[PDB]
From Swiss-Prot:
Residues 34-76 form the CAP-Gly domain. The gene is Clip4. It comes from the Eukaryota. It comes from Mus musculus. Signal peptide: none annotated. This is CAP-Gly domain-containing linker protein 4.
Length: 91
């Protein structure tokens, strides 16, 4: 399992994407994408439009985004979700 070897890879996140938390039920804009220095694993620098997080834009010696105190949050793809299908345009 590395860069798509065993177990497929449905990781489609680079930037300017939208994902909804599967715990707090709050949309979040994807700013950063990749491994972190404070933790061991992949993360996604999210940024909310209000004080509903636990980050100050950056954590440690790595910048993920820029926002007010406790505005954005850091979560993993598997920890986040987002639509993709199109479906009937009418409605």
């Amino acid at each position: 399992g590395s860069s798509g070897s065993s177990g497929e890879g449905t990781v489609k996140l680079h930037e300017g994407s939208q994902v909804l938390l599967t715990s707090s039920n709050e949309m979040a804009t994807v700013r950063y994408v990749g491994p972190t220095d404070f933790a061991s694993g992949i993360w996604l620098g999210l940024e909310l439009r209000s004080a509903k997080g636990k980050n100050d834009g950056a954590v440690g010696d790595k910048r993920y985004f820029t926002c007010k105190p406790n505005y954005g949050v850091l979560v993993r793809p598997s920890r986040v979700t987002y639509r993709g299908i199109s479906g009937p345009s009418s409605g």
